[PDB]
Every structure is written in structure tokens, then in C-alpha cells.
Ligand binder design. Sequence first.
Ligand SMILES: CCCCCCCCCCCCCCCCCC(=O)O[C@@H](COC(=O)CCCCCCCCCCCCCCC)COP(=O)(O)OCC[N+](C)(C)C
Ligand SMILES: CCCCCCCCCCCCCCCCCC(=O)O[C@@H](COC(=O)CCCCCCCCCCCCCCC)COP(=O)(O)OCC[N+](C)(C)C
Ligand SMILES: CCCCCCCCCCCCCCCCCCCC(=O)O[C@H](COC(=O)CCCCCCCCCCCCCC)COP(=O)(O)OCCN
Ligand SMILES: CCCCCCCCCCCCCCCCCCCC(=O)O[C@H](COC(=O)CCCCCCCCCCCCCC)COP(=O)(O)OCCN
Ligand SMILES: CCCCCCCCCCCCCCCCCCCC(=O)O[C@H](COC(=O)CCCCCCCCCCCCCC)COP(=O)(O)OCCN
Ligand SMILES: CCCCCCCCCCCC(=O)SCCNC(=O)CCNC(=O)[C@H](O)C(C)(C)COP(=O)(O)O
Lengths: 127, 57, 33, 536, 83, 438, 97, 83, 120
Amino acid sequence: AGAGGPVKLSPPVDKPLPYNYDFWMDNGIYPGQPIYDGMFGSMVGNMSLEYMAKGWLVLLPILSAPFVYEHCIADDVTRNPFVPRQYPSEVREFLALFKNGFVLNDYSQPDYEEMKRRQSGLLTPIY
Amino acid sequence: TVMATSLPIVNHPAFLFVAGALTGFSLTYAITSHYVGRKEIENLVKFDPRYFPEYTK
Amino acid sequence: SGHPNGSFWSEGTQVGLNGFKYGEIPLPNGQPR
Amino acid sequence: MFLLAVYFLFFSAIANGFFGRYLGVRGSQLLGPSALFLALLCSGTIFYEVCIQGCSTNIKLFENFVYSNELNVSASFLYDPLAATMTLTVVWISCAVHAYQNLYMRGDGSQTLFTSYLSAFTGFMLILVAGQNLVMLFIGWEGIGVCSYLLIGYYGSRVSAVKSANKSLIVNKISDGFLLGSMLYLWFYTGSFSYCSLATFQIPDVVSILVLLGAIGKSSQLFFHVWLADAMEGPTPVSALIHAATLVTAGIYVLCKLNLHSQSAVGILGAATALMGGLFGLAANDLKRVIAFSTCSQLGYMMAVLSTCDDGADFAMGHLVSHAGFKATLFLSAGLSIAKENNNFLNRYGSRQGSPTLSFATTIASLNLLGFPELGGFYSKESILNNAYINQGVSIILTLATFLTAFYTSKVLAQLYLFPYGNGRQQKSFDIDATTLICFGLLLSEMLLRIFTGSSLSQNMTTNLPAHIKNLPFWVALSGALSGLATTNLFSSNFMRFFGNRGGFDVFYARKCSNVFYHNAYVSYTLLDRGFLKLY
Amino acid sequence: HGLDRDTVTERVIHVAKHFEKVDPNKITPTATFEELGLDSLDTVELVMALEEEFGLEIPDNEADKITTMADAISYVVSNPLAK
Amino acid sequence: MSLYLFMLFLQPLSLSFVSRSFSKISSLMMSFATLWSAVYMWFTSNGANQTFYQVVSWGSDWSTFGVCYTSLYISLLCAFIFPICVILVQGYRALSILICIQTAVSLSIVSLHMLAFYALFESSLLLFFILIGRRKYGSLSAAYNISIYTFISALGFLISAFWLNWSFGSVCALLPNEEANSFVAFGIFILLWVKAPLVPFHLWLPEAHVYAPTAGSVLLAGVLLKISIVGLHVFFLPICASSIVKAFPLILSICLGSFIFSSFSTLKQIDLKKIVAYSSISHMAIVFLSSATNSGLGIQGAVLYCIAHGLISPGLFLLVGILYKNTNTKLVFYLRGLSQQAPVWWSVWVFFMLGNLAFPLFPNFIAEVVCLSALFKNHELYAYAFIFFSFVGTVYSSTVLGRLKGGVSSQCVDASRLDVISWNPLVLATVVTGIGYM
Amino acid sequence: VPEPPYAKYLANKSHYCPPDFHYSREIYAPYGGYFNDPKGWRTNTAIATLVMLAGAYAVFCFGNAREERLRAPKGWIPSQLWNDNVPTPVDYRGKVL
Amino acid sequence: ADRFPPPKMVATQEEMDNADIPYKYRDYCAHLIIDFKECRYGHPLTWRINCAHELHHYNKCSYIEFKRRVAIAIEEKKRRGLM
Amino acid sequence: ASEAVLRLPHKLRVMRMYRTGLKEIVNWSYGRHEFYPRANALRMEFEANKELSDREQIRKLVLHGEDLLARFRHWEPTIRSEFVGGTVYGVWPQHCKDVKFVPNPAYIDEFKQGDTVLLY
Ligand SMILES: CCCCCCCCCCCCCCCCCC(=O)O[C@@H](COC(=O)CCCCCCCCCCCCCCC)COP(=O)(O)OCC[N+](C)(C)C
Ligand SMILES: CCCCCCCCCCCCCCCCCC(=O)O[C@@H](COC(=O)CCCCCCCCCCCCCCC)COP(=O)(O)OCC[N+](C)(C)C
Ligand SMILES: CCCCCCCCCCCCCCCCCCCC(=O)O[C@H](COC(=O)CCCCCCCCCCCCCC)COP(=O)(O)OCCN
Ligand SMILES: CCCCCCCCCCCCCCCCCCCC(=O)O[C@H](COC(=O)CCCCCCCCCCCCCC)COP(=O)(O)OCCN
Ligand SMILES: CCCCCCCCCCCCCCCCCCCC(=O)O[C@H](COC(=O)CCCCCCCCCCCCCC)COP(=O)(O)OCCN
Ligand SMILES: CCCCCCCCCCCC(=O)SCCNC(=O)CCNC(=O)[C@H](O)C(C)(C)COP(=O)(O)O
């Protein structure tokens, strides 16, 4: 039965309240909770922050291993066995404008250097 | 016994071995695939006489 | 459970005021407030 | 004609939420679904006109919504091919959920207010999708945020539910702050808020980072995914809408509408989110939480595909619209299962006589999730996986994510149907009316139509890949499914515990960020203004 | 729903039978677990099995106070969530 | 203009001749008639007259009164919100005090003479000292705080006005004068620094709001905080622009610090009126900084956001006063289950709290967009700083709403017919401005 | 406790209301009571539907007046039946229809 | 690049605009994608069965273009001495 | 082990360990079928050391079992919905009687409602 279920009422305060009792959220039902669960009190699974940090320390190298190879170790010539899509000159010139384009990696092109410098563009507006 | 009444084959040793072999092959192939597939995509063209006569003999 | 008469298109089971709007009690004889 | 659907949804919201005393519980149970059915006809007309027949329309309701000096914005609706597709998907899912809530929410006090929230919730999604300028999108964005706040915290006497709503509100606030920054950047250097003049071929990185940070909020990506799991406190109809279409998809829609994203960031973030979501869904024991983590993983796939190719935006949208269907079906069937068993934990579910329609809908939605061949989800997911081969790092992580997805999907199916009965010997029952059957029929019709009509124009376009590379995702999914059926152990107890805690993102916030926040508050108030600067 | 004593007695007696050591006539509506032949670790299992039978969660401190057939029936009768 | 001034002078005049049992009715009629006179002033104000819509003088430089864009908006806002204050307040003493306060404040807005502005604005110094320090429900400490803060800031402003009158020969706004002196610029600035609550001179506002009556709080939040922007646009920016541009990094430092620390101080509040009062302080900083940019966007955005605040914060204060009448408590921890117990009050409370969080369908959204655009015109980082730390407001607003929303309560505390009549105009105005009729 | 006199004016518990669930019947909420089902609900729903369709007609007029198609559709679209500002369709090749 | 010259562009600018072909699709295959697009949107739900010849032709030309891309890659790589 | 568990007597402490262990078997299982063999295994694990009389060894076993039960606490306890920590606990709590409702509020001294400024 969704409606009308019995509930336990939280006991009324009977002792001097701590100054930071606003960290406790109590609506009158018995299981009151911290303002943010895990800030204090019982920990889910009895796992501290140190345990989670050690687990992440174990995971990150394995997760980052696929990404680091292509992004850093690999180079445009050796990343893929083919060149980017070849377009007619009118289409290619427009597509090369996009900083987030995919034709900027065409090392066959004679404008490769300028295209690469376009890809690594400005961090912030100059004006 | 995982599912005795419905699907008892899962408890069979042969099913466990086939499933584990598939897991290993699929997962390790996922990593080695990149080198492999890039090699076949290069070899398709390099040994095609029309595109590259020199490499073919 | 179900619908009150077994038909969805049956007259509502609730007669009276669902609540007191602004907390005011309806007058007995229908006298305007 | 194009305006009519938003009118129908907002009329349903106003009627049920302000005059529901006169209408009644039955009155909502008619006016809601009827209005959304009419909106579904209007959305179908829009989809045929714009997508199939290539006829975009602009409706300007009124001009000078904000007119201060040069800053000028107008309330206008542009139905472009993206907008029509999202509108159709959203209205279809929302009509289904409104049919669902007639029987599910009958045991809830405020069914009229729930229907009103659901209808305004859909209306704000359509405002976001069809806006012609950035300000209308922001209006819809904040509307869906507030509607999620009022729907997750529907059970106010539960501390967990209201805290979940507060979590959603705060995280979404940070995200739209970043979006508002990007909006101001784009107005300043392009001259307008409209998407037509919004186009920039080269954009400075700050704008891209701000756009991405804003998008990762609603489309819950890593470091911003905390709210999605807690969003389970709300009623089941809310979860279906938020996870299927309205909230999660909005970030992807924004990233596709404006192609200011950077390939390097999106691919890494998406692949990381997909892997982490699958790993988290492995540990979960609530039925509803596993499906949310699966939603996270699918969002990771969609975000990753943007980096791959020029068609990545189309592929992401196709997976978006395909995903809405079977995910909504999965939530609705899970909610019916909870009602029938009075339980939320996967251990105590089991084989029991039931409706053939619901079990079939669950099976087909889970098959679409897994990647079962010749299905709508299969095509939209292979379009991503096969085209991600060029990005070696992304492709590997997505393939492992496919394995994990298959494993927990098959585990959930075995635990719900194949496993022996696990609940107690008590009278528990939820009899389903014809309205719920019409709901699941609508979802199944969406799924079936997706196969015939497709998701993207380049869905069946060839990716010139070797056969063993192209058919690899199927083998990984099959291996994951077979391992899931056997219910084997994949990770050690330490890593299983780590995944059960969802990576400890929330515990870090608790112990460091929240404590620093309230120590800053302590310094600001107690030490300074009620301390140093207060007289004796 | 307040469940009547007679049904609760029948179901607690039904649960108590499944221990092999306990002889089917020794279990009475008023009998302590010791006379039945149950150990402390057995009483744990019986309290848990009562938890499945009536679909309730016994908070642990009350679980310690259950040592007899009688008081278990009393506790189940007291509970308004007992099914 | 002349009709508006005459009616402003007529309202305190009527109280002397009324029967003392008809005082409430006569005061309400006078307030509505002043509102209608303000509408007439708007009607007779032609936009063709770009500099000043209307100027009237009654025989001296001090008696020079005029309306501009800022003055007209603020005067219409005060005339709009006064009747709600009138109905909320009972007794001839209270009516007299509130009528005199409103007459002085409304005459200050349209004044064009710095010395007359000072004379009218500070005439309401004892009236708040008596009002906030009333017998049973008032606190003497808060009255002392507000009175002393106002006296020191206004005396500095007066000294600057004396120097301008000595050097130029005039202190009227209509006569173009420019000064580069920093002492006079600071003398004018300190009043704005105190009146618009800006850290660290914001301590008076909280104590005043909590211990003022609901009508008093409504007036204080609605228009007395806005008097700072009338002074800034009318008496500081025309003459003291060189100093605001010289000190802009310092101005930004103080404004953004006020925003951040007021937001953090709001988090430590357990009293509803204090929560609203601290939200006001955080809201004032954006207005002050947007005006200080001295750009077309900034001035318009600041006056718009002042109108939005003067429609949203009076509503929150009114709702809190109604709840305190029903419950005799303002502590959030005592108040629970208000959603179930007061659905009609809860709906309006949530609506106004959404307005205070600047959600799109509210005027605060449009106003904030314009102000942030002005800040972005100055620099990107300026807007980014304000946009991020807006999340702190969400935390405390959400915590308050969650604490009030649910729980166990044995009291039906919902508003009566009088209360709903009290907020209906504010809700209608909020909606109308939110859809773009700013 | 003897029910107060005004309890007669208050309405009963609806059929959908669970028998165990107790709510205060005096509280007024615009969205309705705890389980509603008022008498005369059918007529209210009919009136609501009439208002919905009338507003739909007004919105349809407004949208048709403000619906601007600046590019010709590729094929025939349903809007041609009701709006006359649709440009004549041109197909992918370029031929006018 | 020079060794493997671009093919002739059958589709012209006015035809691509008339078919509303995005610039990304204008890759020496545009005529075939015009055919596939017109047939796909001609058959909204049977295009998978009906529209198979056009898709086949597009995929064939795309395969040839992909082979050209790989040939260009090999030529450039051998020119740089990497192989 | 918590303070409340420590303050318990030996008999009740071992009983608590058995109860918590059984509940954690339920939580870590995938179905009821896994439960029975694991429950029998826990049964045998406790029965193996029941006849020990050396206090120091018994203290070692109790402490080690308490550490093991602390580490294997499940992130997600399987709790019935209607009980504390359950989904349906407090969804629509039954509202109690004796509610303080003020009838016709606006018509109690309608003209003179408001705040007054009292002075000396
Ligand atoms: C965009 C153009 C069209 C605009 C239409 C907007 C859609 C409807 C707008 C109606 C007015 C919006 C503001 C309504 C008042 C805000 C309060 C509210 O919405 O709900 C109230 C009460 O609701 C009402 O009485 C009135 C609601 C009527 C319809 C509301 C639709 C949803 C609001 C839309 C969100 C506003 C958008 C603002 C940001 C863009 C409180 O609800 P809860 O806190 O959840 O508690 C209820 C009790 N229970 C615990 C059981 C859940
Ligand atoms: C207790 C409350 C119970 C009663 C509830 C009342 C329900 C209210 C219904 C919601 C109304 C939604 C209408 C929103 C449109 C705003 C209406 C409007 O602004 O009128 C416009 C005319 O425009 C319209 O009529 C719009 C047509 C409305 C119907 C269109 C379809 C309805 C779907 C709703 C989608 C609206 C999203 C707009 C988001 C901003 C005025 O035209 P102008 O002369 O140009 O005015 C100048 C512009 N400005 C206001 C900014 C100064
Ligand atoms: C896939 C993309 C990446 C996903 C997220 C990866 C996050 C990786 C960050 C963790 C890995 C490096 C951790 C730093 C090394 C610390 C190792 C020992 C931990 C330790 O001794 O102290 C801890 C400090 O917390 C800490 O260690 C907090 C440092 C965390 C840096 C902030 C990065 C955001 C982390 C968010 C998720 C990570 C959750 C787990 C960290 C516990 O402190 P204590 O409570 O015992 O102190 C006592 C209270 N007086
Ligand atoms: C060439 C000259 C060199 C410099 C020489 C400087 C010498 C000192 C100059 C200080 C002048 C400032 C005057 C304000 C004094 C503070 C208020 C007095 C404190 C006080 O106890 O007042 C009580 C309440 O006041 C309150 O509650 C008010 C709280 C504090 C008011 C805040 C001060 C105003 C803002 C300060 C700066 C503003 C901008 C400055 C440009 C009432 O006391 P009582 O009536 O019961 O009498 C009983 C006697 N114990
Ligand atoms: C420490 C941070 C500063 C706090 C202020 C924060 C922001 C306030 C800015 C308000 C904007 C307009 C105000 C004009 C200038 C006020 C203060 C500006 C900063 C300042 O003190 O500059 C000084 C010059 O101003 C002066 O010489 C006069 C300073 C103000 C006098 C203080 C009291 C005056 C009261 C007069 C009452 C009215 C009198 C009217 C006749 C010295 O800077 P510098 O140029 O010498 O550079 C030497 C550095 N190496
Ligand atoms: C999910 C993973 C689950 C984790 C499981 C880990 C649990 C660890 C289990 C192993 C720890 C132990 O053996 S803890 C065993 C501690 N050993 C003793 O206490 C010896 C003295 N025994 C007695 O006094 C009684 O026989 C008594 C047994 C109290 C009963 O009383 P009854 O005679 O009246 O039945």
C-alpha cells in the first residue's frame, strides 16, 4: 500500500543542540539524514575516501592507456592507413576553414602546415 | 546451480568454457584489431597491381 | 478497486466540497458571504 | 499547425494543475492522454513536412522579448530537420507515459498535479528543441530543469527524494551558468542569438569548453553524473521521461545544433562515461539504477561519436532517437515489475505468470540495448562503433563498454524472468488495464518503425572496414551476454565495492567540496559579520 | 493490518517444524526454544525464517528478546506491517 | 507631474482631518489615487522629450522636480507597492509613520536637487528609528544600526553637495557640471555604498528587515534600496564619471566581494526574513556594477533589474509575514509540511522563489541577461565571475525549500481571502513583466 | 472525537481513496483533493475539451498567419490544404511540380 | 597525390544545391548520393528494400575513392621514407 | 564493530555476527538459489569453533569475523520497501487527527487586521 503506511516519528530534541545542527536534516520521520550523504556518519559500504582514491589510482593508468597512444605517441601520418576524405577544391577550401573539421589532417595537401596551425587555434578572443 | 529449472546448460562446464573463450577472444581481439585491420587496409592497395605495380612481382 | 460502478464514465462518488477555499465555511441557507 | 502541439501540452498542464478540482482524477485521465494524442498527430504532420519533404518553417510569436539597446531577441520557433525528429520522439514517448500514469498513479494522492507536471515537462522540452535562437533554448532548458526539480521531489516526506531534487537543481545550475557564458560569447562576436548567424568556422577554445561544460550537465557525463543515479527517488513515469528524452538528450542536442565542440575532449569524455556507466551498472542491485547507468553508457557512446567523423552528429542524433524508445520501455516495464512484486531489488525477482505483452516488451528493449542484430538499436550502435575505429583509444573503450553492457543486460533479464521466484509468499498483484497495453503497443510500434525507416541517412552507408573488424561488436556483445547468463564473477571484491560506490565521486564532494563550502560560509558569517563586525 | 493470533500461531508453528531436531509434537503455542531443542545459532535462523514468513524486518535488539514460541507470536501480532 | 506631487502632499494631509476610524479606508483610497496620478504622469510623459520627460519648478532650485527613465520606473514601482503596505498595517500611529515615510521617499525620487534629495530622503530617519524599535516586536539595536549608518553616509553626501554648491554655484542636476576631485566623488559614493547594501556596509539591512513590520519590510526592500540607483544615475554618474572609471577595479572588487560573501552568509541563516534580506544584498551588487560601467546596456539593465527585485522581494516578504501571522514562527526548522498544509501559500512561495533564482519566465531573467551582457561588454571574466557564483543562491534556496516542503505537521496554516488579495497584484505584475512587458 | 459541524459541508472519501488512508478534508488545493472524483466531472471535462478546441482554433489561425516557408518543399506537404503561402514544390533534380 | 589523380566531378554546383546536399557529402560521389537521397526520401519506409541499387552504387564508388585514399597514403609515406 | 555490538555479551555478540553474516549473504547473492549453500557454509564456519574454550583464541576469532563482516558490508542493503531504508517508507505517510484548523480566517476582526506600532 503506497498511501497510509506506518512511519516512525523522530524523537523531540531533549538536550542542548550543537551549533552546526543545521548539518542534520530531519523532517520528523525517524531516519534523519545529513545535508549531503557521506559528509559525516555512516559510510556506504564502509569505504573511506582513501579507499576510493587508491582504487582510482589503480584504474586511471589502464583507462588512459588507449587514449595516450593515439593522442601523443601516434602522429597524423601513422595514425591511420589512409588520408582524410578527398574533396573538390571548392568544397575542400570551405571545409578546411572549420577549426573543428576533419580535413585539416590531410598531410598530402600543400597547405598542411597552415591547416595544422589553424587547428591549434586561439585559446581566448584577442579582442 | 545458477538456473536449474529454466536453462540448466549454463551450469555445464562446456558452456562456461565456451563463454570464457568467447570473452577472451573478443576482448583481446578488440585491442589487437587496430594493428591488424590497418595492415589489411594497407595490404589491399599495396598489392593491387593497378594502384602499385612496383610492390607486386 | 477499479472504477466505482465498473464504468469509467459514471457519476463522481464525491458530493460536497473537496476543501474549504480560503478556509471559509459555506453558509447554511446559501446566503452570500 | 506547428504551434498546436506545444499549445496542447501546456493546456493539459494548466487544466490539470489549476482546474483539476473540477476535472477530477478521471478528468485528468482523459484530458491528458487525449491532448497528447492530438499533439502526436500534429507532430507526425510536422515530421512528414520537415524531415521527409525538406520544408523548414519559422514561426515568430512576437518580437523584442528582450529589447535593451543593441541586445535584441525574439520569441521564434524554427522547425528544422533535427527539431522535427526530436519533437516526434518526445511527443510519442510522452503520450505513452501519460497513458501509463493513468493506472500507475491511481494510488497516488495528486494524480492531476502529476499529469500537469508531465505535460508542462513535455512542453518545455518542445520549446527547447524548436527554438530558433539561443534564448528560447535557455527557456526550455530551465523549464525542464525546474520540472525535474518538481517531479523528482514529488514525495516530500522522504528526505532522500527532496535531497535528490536539490542535487539535480544545483548541478544543472552550474551547467547552465557555463551555457549562459557561452551564449554571451556568441552574441558578442557574432552579432545575434539566432543559430543562422551563430555560425563560426573558427571559435576560441574558451567558448568550446564553456559549451561542453554546459552540455555535460543535463547529458550526464563524468563529474556531472551524480544526479542521474539519485533521480531514482521520483516516481517511475518521471524516470522514463527524464532518462529517455527530456533531460539527458538535451546536451547532445545542443552539441549537435551548434558544432563548436572539440574532437579531443568529447571523445575522451564520452568513452570514459560509457565505460564508467557500464562498470557502475555492473554492481547495482536495484532494477531502476542499472537502467540509469545504462543510460549513462549510451550517452557516452553518443558523445564519443561526435569526435569520429563529420557524420558523427547525425549518428549521435540517430542513436539518441533510437535510445529514447527502448529505454522508455525498459523503465515502464521495470516500474510495472516493481508494482507487481512490491520490490526494487533484483535478487527477489523471479519467474512468475504475467502478461505476455510486458515480458515481450522487456525482452525486445533489452535486446535493442544489447545490440542484437537486425534491430533499431543494433544499427544505431554499430554506426558508432564501426566509425570509431579511426580513433583507436575511443574504439577500444567503447568495445569494452559493449561487453559490460551485454553482461549486465543479460544478468537483468535472467534475474527478472529466467531465475526462480525469489520474493515471499504474500498476496501481491498489479492488474494491467487496456491503457497500459496501448502504452506498450505505442512503444513497440516505435521500435518496429525504427527498423524500417532507419535513424540516419548514412546508417547503411559503407564503412570501408575488414569483415572481422566490422562484425566484432556482435562477438563482444555475445560474449558479454553469455557471461551474464552464467552470472560469473568478473572483478575482485575490492573493485566490485568500488563500482558499487559509483567511483566515490559523491564521497569526495562530501568530504572536501561541501566542507570547504560550509567553512567558507562559516568564515563569511560567524567569524566576520556576526563576529568581528558585531557589537557586544 | 492487525493479524489475529490464531493465524500467526499457525504460521510460526509451521516455520518451527522445519528444524530436524525439533520433534513435531513438542512445539506448542507456549514453549521456549530450549525445550524444543534449539541452540542460539538455531534461534538466529528461526528469527530470520519468521522474517520471511511474515514479510517483516525484525530490528536486532528485539530479535534478541525473542527466545520463546510465545513472545515471537506476541511480537508478530504487535507488528502492524506483518503480512 | 504636478498632479503626482499634489497627491503625494495630499496623502499625509488627509490623515490630519480624517475621523481616526476612517483612516484605513481613506489611506487606501489615497494610495490608489496616487497610483492613478503616477499613471497620469506616465501618460503625460512623451518619449520625444529624450533628456527629461517632465520638469517642474515651484520657485527655487530646491523645488525643482523632474522625471527621467529611472525616476519614472522607480516612482511607478513605489506607487504600485504602497497600497499593499497600507492594508497590512493597522493603527493611526503606524499609518501616520508609513504615510510620512512614503511621501518623503517618493518626493526624493523625482527631486533634481542634491540638497533637496538629501532633505527629503533623511526626513525619514526617526520614523524608522521609531518603527523598527517599536514596543513589543521591535529591536533598538537594529534601529540604532540603520539610523547611524544612514546619518554618516548622508552627511558625507551632504558635504560633497556643499562643495559642489560652493564651486559651481549650483547643485541641481539640470546644470551640467563635472568634477575630477576624488574627495567629493567619495563623499557622494559613500551614501551609495551604504544605502545599496554593499560589503562591508551591509550590516544594517538584515537587522532592520527582521525587526521591521511586514509593511515596513515591503517598503524597505521595494524602493528604499532602489533610491541608490536614482542617486547614481541622477547625482553621481553625470558629474563623477571620471572617478568611477578611475576606480573601476576597486569598484569591481567591492561589488563581487559583496555578491560572494552575501551569498555565503545567506547559507548560515535559520530565519526566513533574514534569508530574503541577504538575497537582496547579493542582488544589489549586479545592479551597482552594471550601472558603474556607464554604458547604455548597464543603466537600462540596472533599472530593469531593480524593477524585477521590487516585484519579487516584496512578494517573498509578504508571504513570510503571512506565514508568521499563521504560525508565530520564522525559524525554518519549526516549519514543515507546508506543501500539504498550505498548498495555495506553497504555490506562490515556490513561484516567487523561482523568480528570485532568475528563471526564464520571470522578470529577473531578462534583467539579469541585460546586466550580464553589459558586464560582458566590459570584460568576459567580469560576467563569468558573477555567473558562476550564482550557484550559491541555488544551494540555500533549495535547502530552504526542501526543509519547508515535507515532514509531519499538525497545523493547517494556509492563507485567508485577505492574504490572497494582498499578493494577487504582485503575481500579475510579475507575470506581465516576465513575458517581456518590462 | 465528535466531528465538527462543518464536516457536513465537506465531501466524503472517494472510491479511489484507500480505506486506511486518512487526509484532512478541510484543506483546499487548486489541483484537487487527495482523490477527487467530484460530482459533475463529466460536464467539466466536456467544457474543458470545448475550451481546448476553441484555443486550438485560435492558435491555428495565428500560426497559419505567421507560418513562413521561404524554401520550396521537395514534395507535396499537408500544409498546402490549409495554408496558401506554401511555395510550389521543386524536386531534387530541380523540376517544378 | 599526383600519382593518383582526382576523378571527374559529375555532379555540378547547381545540382548539388538543388538536391540540398551538404558540403560534407560532396566528395566525388555526390551524383550517386543525389540518387540515393531522392530514392530514400521518395520511399519513407520501404527504402531499405526498394532503395538498394542506389545504395549499392554509392557504396561502390565510395569504396573506389577509399582505395584511392589508401594509395595516396602509401605514396606519401614512401616519399617520406617511413616505408 | 560498533560500540553497541562491543557492549553486548558474548552469546549475543556471536548471535549478531551470525545474523549480520546471513544478511550479507543475502545482499551479495544474485538470487535465493545462491543463499542456501552459502548459509550452510556460514553455519559450518560457526559450528567449527563453537567448542573452543580458550578465551584468547575465541577473542581472536570474534575480532577477525567482525573485521570480515565490516569489510563485506554491501553498498546496497536489500531492505523491504515498507521499512526504514525502504523505497515506500514515507511516500504518503498516514496523516494523524487533531489538526488545528482555523475556520473563516479572514472574517475574524476583518477591518482591524494588521500590525500596530505601540509606543511609550
Ligand atoms: C512557456 C509558455 C507557456 C507557459 C506555461 C507554463 C506551464 C504551467 C505554468 C503554470 C505557472 C508556473 C508556476 C506555477 C506555480 C509554481 C508552484 C508549482 O508549480 O507547484 C506547486 C503547486 O502546484 C500548483 O498548485 C500549481 C501548478 C500548476 C501547473 C504547474 C506546471 C509546472 C510548472 C511549470 C514550471 C514553471 C516554469 C518556470 C521556469 C521557466 C508546488 O508543487 P510541489 O512543491 O511539488 O508540492 C506539491 C505537493 N506534492 C508534494 C504532493 C507534490
Ligand atoms: C491561477 C492561474 C490560472 C490561470 C492560468 C492562465 C494560463 C495562462 C496561459 C499561458 C499563456 C501562454 C502564452 C505565451 C505567449 C505570450 C503572450 C504574448 O506575449 O502576447 C504577444 C502576442 O504573441 C502571441 O500571441 C503568442 C501566441 C501564443 C500562442 C502560441 C502557441 C501557444 C504555445 C505556447 C508557447 C509559447 C512559448 C513562448 C516562450 C516565450 C503580444 O504581442 P506583441 O504586440 O508583439 O507584444 C510585444 C512583445 N512583448 C510582449 C515582449 C512586449
Ligand atoms: C576517468 C577520468 C578521471 C575520473 C576521476 C579520477 C579522479 C582521480 C583522483 C584520485 C586519484 C589520485 C588521488 C590522490 C592520491 C591520494 C591517495 C591517498 C588518499 C589519501 O590518503 O587521502 C585522501 C584524500 O582525498 C583525495 O585523495 C582527493 C583527491 C582527489 C583529487 C580531485 C580529483 C577529483 C576526484 C573525484 C572522483 C575521485 C573520488 C576519489 C578521490 C582521503 O582524504 P581523507 O578524507 O582521509 O582526509 C582526512 C580528513 N582529515
Ligand atoms: C581626524 C579624526 C581622526 C579619526 C578619529 C576617529 C575617532 C572615532 C570616530 C568614530 C566615529 C563613528 C561614530 C560611530 C560610533 C559607533 C556607534 C557607537 C557604538 C554604540 O555603542 O552605539 C550603540 C548602538 O549603536 C549601534 O548599534 C551601531 C553599530 C555601529 C554603527 C556602525 C558605524 C557606522 C558605519 C561606520 C563607517 C561608515 C562609513 C565611514 C566613512 C548605542 O549606544 P547607547 O545609545 O546605548 O549609549 C550608551 C553608551 N555606551
Ligand atoms: C584602499 C582601497 C580603497 C577603498 C575604496 C574602494 C572603492 C571606492 C571607490 C569610490 C569611487 C569614487 C571615489 C573616489 C576615490 C575614493 C578612493 C579611491 C582609492 C584611493 O584612495 O585613492 C587615493 C586618492 O583618493 C583620495 O585622495 C581621496 C580618498 C577618499 C578620501 C576618504 C574620505 C573622504 C571623505 C570626504 C567627504 C566629502 C568631502 C567633499 C569635499 C590615493 O590614490 P593615489 O592617486 O594618490 O595613488 C597613490 C598610490 N601610489
Ligand atoms: C558476505 C560474507 C559474509 C561474511 C562472513 C564472515 C563471518 C565470520 C564467521 C567466522 C567467525 C566465527 O566463527 S565467531 C565464533 C566464536 N567462537 C566462540 O564463541 C566459541 C565459544 N562458543 C560459545 O560460547 C557458544 O557455543 C556459541 C557459539 C556462542 C553459541 O551458543 P549456543 O551453544 O547456545 O548455541
